[PDB]
Amino acid sequence: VNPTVFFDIAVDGEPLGRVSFELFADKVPKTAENFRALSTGEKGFGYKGSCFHRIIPGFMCQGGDFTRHNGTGGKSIYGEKFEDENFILKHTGPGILSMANAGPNTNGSQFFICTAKTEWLDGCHVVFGKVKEGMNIVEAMERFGSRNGKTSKKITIADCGQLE
Known part of the structure; x- marks a missing residue:
């Protein structure tokens, strides 16, 4: 099966609730593996303790900068940067999980x-998953943005890990 991963989300350290994601390993296996490993922290680094630095209500929540915490940072399990695997999957609605980039x-x-x-x-950002449970937690998060x-x-x- 495609993997499932979870984040437990906190607001200034107060529990907000759990979001779970399906990762489309069937269509973007390299991009899905990156997010899965960073969610488990099995390699000794990843998403745990990282912040959503950029939240724009009605658009998206941006996270995953666990090096510089401000959108300049982050690293893949394959080195600093890796290629756009494909653009098969599209930004079709709320809950879509897609990669931020700098070109x-x-x-x-x-x-x-x-x-x-x-x-x-569509065609600029690699889509690689979707929210499965806790779209209400993502809607709550999005109220703390501007x-x-x-x-x-x-x-x-x-906290974060794999359920698969």
Whole structure:
């Protein structure tokens, strides 16, 4: 089966609740493996204790910068950066999990959770999963964001792992 991973989300260290994701290993196995390993922390680094640095209500929650905590950072399990695997999967609606980047072939650890259909990103950002449970937790998170993306409180991944 495709893997399932979870984040436990906290607001300034208070439990908010659990989000679980399906990873589309069947269509983007390299990109799915990256996010799975960073979620388990089996390699000794990954998402745990990292923040959603950029949240824009009605757009997306951006996270996964566990090096520099501000959108300049993050690293893949394959080195700093890796290639765009394909653009088969599209930004079809709320719950879509897609890679943030800084142009072609600059995939790291940074990702976003769509709270809308973001079709203008189709072909620019590799889609690799979707929210399975806790879309209400993502909707709560999205209320701590602003038009520029600054969060009014610290939104953290207190825990994460694989359920598969």
